[PDB]
Design a protein around this ligand. Structure first.
Ligand SMILES: O=P(O)(O)O[C@H]1[C@H](OP(=O)(O)O)[C@@H](OP(=O)(O)O)[C@H](OP(=O)(O)O)[C@@H](OP(=O)(O)O)[C@H]1OP(=O)(O)O
Ligand code: NA
Length: 210
């Protein structure tokens, strides 16, 4: 059964050292990725979020690093080796989207688009300093429900791509206007107009670029 990343329970994003850690099970049918490595960034201490982050890493088990990061900016690596992060990198940000508006959700794991950009910019420098690694992403995949407007023209993803650039991270951003879930193979599902979970519905996502 799919569990949406659309909120519904209380946000717990503080004190990373007190978060659950879940097992990543490598799946062997992940195929090829354009990214040489990736960071899965788990943004809150919630079972749906933690499982989704672990399942994404399991799709590319040899080149994925999972980080948990809290409201104070403290982070820890819970899967993978940062030394694999060389080349064309993606970050997949995993959290619940919440706080609806005319342009859909306004917060991912409690963070506005501006706040999220600041957090990620600090994290890039902290991670690079502590791990001695350039983790600079080319692409951010926002793995949370309904973080761009239905027509794909407004909302969180648009404010986020600009705020990221303002904070020194020029990235492409993929983001979904619908509810979103991650399955046991690390593949994403969105909800269609009928409320049914589907895969590869390109109409539910947009890739914002420069
Ligand atoms: O090649 P596929 O097996 O079809 O997997 C794709 C691919 O991810 P991989 O890197 O794991 O191959 C996409 O990556 P892009 O190069 O297009 O960026 C990703 O898109 P996002 O990066 O935007 O997350 C997409 O996810 P989506 O379902 O949202 O299209 C995902 O497909 P799966 O969901 O089946 O893993
Ligand atoms: Na692929």
């Amino acid at each position: 059964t799919k569990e949406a990343l659309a909120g519904g329970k209380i946000l717990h994003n503080q004190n990373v050292n007190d978060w659950e850690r879940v097992v990543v099970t490598p799946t062997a049918d992940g195929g090829e990725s354009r990214f040489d490595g990736q960071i899965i960034v788990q943004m809150e201490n919630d079972d749906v979020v933690a499982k989704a982050a672990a399942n994404l890493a399991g799709k590319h088990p040899e080149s994925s690093v999972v980080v948990q990061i809290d409201s104070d900016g403290n982070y820890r690596v819970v899967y993978g080796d940062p030394s694999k992060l060389d080349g064309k990198l993606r970050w997949q940000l995993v959290g619940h989207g919440r706080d609806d508006s005319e342009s859909n959700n306004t917060r991912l794991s409690g963070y506005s688009a501006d706040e999220l950009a600041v957090k990620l910019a600090k994290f890039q420098q902290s991670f690079n300093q502590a791990e001695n690694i350039n983790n600079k992403p080319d692409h951010i995949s926002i793995v949370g429900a309904s973080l761009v407007s239905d027509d794909k023209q407004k909302g969180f993803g648009h404010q986020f791509i600009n705020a990221m650039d303002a904070n020194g991270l020029r990235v492409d951003v993929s983001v979904r206007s619908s509810e979103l879930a991650v399955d046991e193979a690390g593949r994403k599902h969105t909800k269609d107009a009928n409320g049914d979970w589907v895969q590869k519905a390109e109409n539910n996502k947009v890739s914002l670029s420069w």
